[PDB]
Amino acid sequence: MSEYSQTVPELVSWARKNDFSISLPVERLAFLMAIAVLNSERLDGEMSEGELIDAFREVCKGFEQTAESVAVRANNAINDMVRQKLLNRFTSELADGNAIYRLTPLGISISDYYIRQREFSTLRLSMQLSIVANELHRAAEAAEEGGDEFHWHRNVFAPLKYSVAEIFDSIDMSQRLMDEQQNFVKEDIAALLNQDWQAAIANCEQLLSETSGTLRELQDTLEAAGDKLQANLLRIQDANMGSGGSELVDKLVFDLQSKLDRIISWGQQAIDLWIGYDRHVHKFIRTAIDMDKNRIFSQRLRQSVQHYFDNPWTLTVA
Amino acid sequence: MSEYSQTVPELVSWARKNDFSISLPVERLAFLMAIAVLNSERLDGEMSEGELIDAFREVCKGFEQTAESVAVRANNAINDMVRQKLLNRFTSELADGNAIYRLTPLGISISDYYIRQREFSTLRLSMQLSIVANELHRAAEAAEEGG
Amino acid sequence: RSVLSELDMMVGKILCYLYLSPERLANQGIFTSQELYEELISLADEGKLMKFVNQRSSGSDLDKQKLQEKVRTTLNRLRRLGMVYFLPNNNNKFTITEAVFRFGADVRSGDDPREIQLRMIRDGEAMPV
DNA sequence: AACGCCTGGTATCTTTATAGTCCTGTCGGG
DNA sequence: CCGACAGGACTATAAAGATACCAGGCGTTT
């Protein structure tokens, strides 16, 4: 069963019928982040209504807002978060009516995107590939040992669905993180070239080399493990075909193979895109540096185009 | 270093200064989900600008909207998603100016919360606990080996 | 008397740098609209310049093609002013002339930009916006 | 016919006003 | 302290208008 059991039109109809929406203003988003932070500092992962109100008061202070009706404003905000599925509320008779609050998977995912400082790591990738390699190897040995539907479900399907698939998703998220990092570096290089292009040449070459080495190191790691992971997926597929199959295991193995191909393909594509940019920046720097030789107008005219909008002027014509 | 290096007042000051916010009405959320579904059916994990516009047209049809300005509305929606950090855009000179799009970790997390039918599996937990037990055991053996 | 548009100035100063560039002198003066466009986006702030084509532009291809068509339009106006000559049989390629140096009137002397600008407006060469 | 320019329309967003909703305060009474 | 009564503030939504952004029409030039 495709993870997304619904076609695009069906999904659109379903979404329209359920009326799902996200609206995160600066103050509410700050309050969510404050709640996420406060929850992370606690031993029980639970927050009382009074503690949430105190957190809202701090946000309001931080926004320099009026102290009037803060208890109401906080209740409105708490009800809005619950109504938006960001917080789960537990009302127990045993708690004398005091409600207990916990953040939902959604409220956490949103708060973590902003607060969690996410940067790409090869050690992490190497570890993840090592674990998945061991999990796939065990699942392949279990598939080759053969067995009943219980053996195939517990020793082959459960590891593939609840362990291998999750690690592949983590690898993909790390790749998507690396993609954001590249776009950030391009913006920094443009800023360095606009401030002082002559002094920025060494810094730009360092940023280009550090990013390139990282992309290549990543790809070398994926390629080394990718062949072993594919061989184990094929061993499982061959063992499944030999033991009369299971459509559930075949579909799951096919999905994992498709993800692995995507994970391997992404690295080569990212390298090609980075190379195009790297060549362009080197060509630009060489053109800026070396082709003006008395070196008189390069600076004189480039700075005028770069900063025109600080003093826009226009010529006159008959 | 605490995963969240900033105290609540510092975070509030920082958030206020960066002016962070998220706006995904039903149509935009549906479009994001449609993009997420379309990306999952592909072999390269990449989407072109024309494919995103076709996806937006289907959402608009599904919302029974006017076919007027759809290419403009789709561009505004695509720019909004990029501006809201949901999509990464790659503009390569090698691609004759054609931009390539990929969903960000954020855009994926949000779409998956709604589309992925997540139900609690005991087997999954048993498996996860097995992997962490092996990873912790290896890390403990490595720590005891010293170095 | 009339004044040129700021987009005309961007294309004018870029055509000026292109004329000077010894790196492209081997072309014997023949340039292509695509090369001009590529040089322009290499130097100016692409996303901030896009604001003039449309107030909502954020890097969409439709907006990038609209920018290219605006450039095609302004370049045709400069051809009428005598600043550039299209090839006899191919309209995607053209040749520069020395008249483009008037776009450098704000920097030909290495002095205070404000004083230069004042001098120019006093002489009737250029107006602000 | 296509490109360039203008005019008006359509979409989007903002502003402005109104009305609601709840809170707060006061007073009186219990 | 409760309960009543109004008044004000705050918040939200509606209404209206403007502004942007494109398209369509029209006019000129290749």
Residue numbers in the entry:
A (entry chain D): 1 to 318
B (entry chain C): 1 to 147
C (entry chain Q): 85 to 213
Original paper wording:
MukBEF folds the chromosome of Escherichia coli and related bacteria. The SMC protein MukB dimerizes at its ‘‘hinge’’ domain, which connects via the long coiled-coil ‘‘arm’’ to the ABC-type ATPase ‘‘head’’ domain.
The DNA was not entrapped inside the complex but bound at its periphery without contacting the top surface of the heads. As the captured DNA is positioned at the open neck gate but not entrapped, we reason that entrapment may be achieved by ingestion through the gate.
